Design a protein around this ligand. Structure first.
Ligand SMILES: NS(=O)(=O)c1ccc(CCN(Cc2ccco2)C(=O)CN(CCC(=O)O)CCc2ccccc2)cc1
Ligand SMILES: NS(=O)(=O)c1ccc(CCN(Cc2ccco2)C(=O)CN(CCC(=O)O)CCc2ccccc2)cc1
Ligand SMILES: [Zn+2]
Length: 258
């Protein structure tokens, strides 16, 4: 795999090794708020993270993942548009080189500074690798970040990043509560889509929260000090690791709220 976010290996090149990049349900997308229809049949989300067990934080060369114990139903997402139970496996972010870009989804073409993805897999498929082969295999909860006041629940993440500066580095990251990354409201938009990085599999029910979280300039500046490169290689700052909006095609975005 030699895909990335550079001019020579970025999103416009991905289709050559991953032809599904030009598929019928690719993500992210622009959320046109006036065209999304309230669906009164959608249920409230059930975010049940009380028993979450975080384990480790990894710089994988594309972002950093906070990984969870998903060998039992400890942190799960249910309800909303979902049938059944989806286990939290990891979260990560996408962010920009400046505050005016970074998110993958957009809202009436507005780009946020960053976007958090809480990744969950449908337990009816037994493991994540099986789930990604199914149209309802994953549920990703997407949360926009804007720059303003600090997010206290993000600080423990920010302060460990110095220890995973380069690709392949990891660190213990136990006892982290992902509930501190949520906004107050769970109002959301939802639509069927894909992974936003290769292999771009069309296996995701996207649930994008309407309310952004606020993070401080200092917090996002620390994201931007990470490296795409490995240790002992010339520095390539980990910034602009977002895929732009893709064609909506034959899909409808539904809103949980009027
Ligand atoms: N899956 S895809 O999107 O369709 C996709 C896959 C491959 C490429 C080409 C990658 N390119 C262009 C590039 C991209 C960024 C800069 O230059 C390279 O030059 C190859 N080279 C650096 C690629 C890399 O690892 O970044 C690695 C091979 C190599 C050989 C010998 C010694 C060391 C390394 C582009 C897109
Ligand atoms: N931005 S996004 O849309 O939210 C989004 C985009 C990409 C991914 C990546 C998913 N991938 C790559 C992948 C795997 C299969 C297809 O694709 C992995 O997680 C790979 N992982 C190893 C590297 C690692 O995780 O350390 C193993 C996953 C696994 C396989 C089998 C059983 C259990 C777990 C997640 C969310
Ligand atoms: Zn993501």
């Amino acid at each position: 795999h030699h895909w990335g976010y550079g001019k020579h290996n970025g999103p416009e090149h991905w289709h050559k090794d991953f032809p599904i990049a030009k598929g019928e349900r690719q993500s992210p997308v622009d959320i046109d708020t006036h065209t999304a229809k309230y669906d009164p049949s959608l249920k409230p989300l059930s975010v049940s993270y009380d028993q979450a067990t975080s384990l480790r934080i990894l710089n994988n060369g594309h972002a950093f993942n906070v990984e969870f114990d998903d060998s039992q139903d400890k942190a799960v997402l249910k309800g909303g548009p979902l049938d059944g139970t989806y286990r939290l496996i990891q979260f990560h972010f996408h962010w920009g080189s400046l505050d005016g870009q970074g998110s993958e989804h957009t809202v009436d073409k507005k780009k946020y500074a960053a976007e958090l993805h809480l990744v969950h897999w449908n337990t009816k498929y037994g493991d994540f690798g099986k789930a990604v082969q199914q149209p309802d295999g994953l549920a990703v909860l997407g949360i926009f970040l804007k720059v303003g006041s600090a997010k206290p629940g993000l600080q423990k993440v920010v302060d460990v990043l110095d220890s995973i500066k380069t690709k392949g580095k990891s660190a213990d990251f136990t006892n982290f509560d992902p509930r501190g990354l949520l906004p107050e409201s769970l109002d959301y938009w939802t639509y069927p889509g894909s992974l936003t990085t290769p292999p771009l599999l069309e296996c995701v029910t996207w649930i994008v929260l309407k309310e952004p979280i606020s993070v401080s300039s200092e917090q996002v500046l620390k994201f931007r000090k990470l490296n795409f490169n490995g240790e002992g290689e010339p520095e390539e700052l980990m910034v602009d690791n977002w895929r732009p909006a893709q064609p909506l095609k034959n899909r409808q975005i539904k809103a949980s709220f009027k």
